[PDB]
């Protein structure tokens, strides 16, 4: 969608290998504010907004 | 009260104290309290600040 209507996907309950985004060279910008994206892997949060 | 001369400077050393402790709770600025979780989840760098 547009920035108009952003959509919004909850995560929660599995298992999150956030290490093949990282690498993945895909994307543009990868960039991470209030924690470093290489220890995105041994972290546990409660729930992910996308 | 009679023993209240000292029975104020326990009181007094123990608030001390307290609020000593209590101090390691705060931020000043810094995103959280505990020195393990902003190492556990920043990179040296930034870290440093």
Do not use: H
Request: charged content about 15%; aromatic content about 10%; hydrophobic content about 40%.
């Amino acid at each position: 969608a547009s920035v108009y209507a952003w959509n919004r996907k909850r995560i929660s309950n599995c298992v999150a290998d956030y290490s093949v985004l990282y690498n993945s060279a895909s994307f543009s910008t990868f960039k991470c504010y209030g924690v470093s994206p290489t220890k995105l892997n041994d972290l546990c949060f409660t729930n992910v907004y996308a | 009260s009679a023993l209240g001369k000292l029975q104020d400077v326990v009181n007094q050393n123990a608030q001390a104290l307290n609020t000593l402790v209590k101090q390691l709770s705060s931020n000043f600025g810094a995103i959280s309290s505990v020195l393990n979780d902003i190492l556990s989840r920043l990179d040296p760098p930034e870290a440093e600040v």
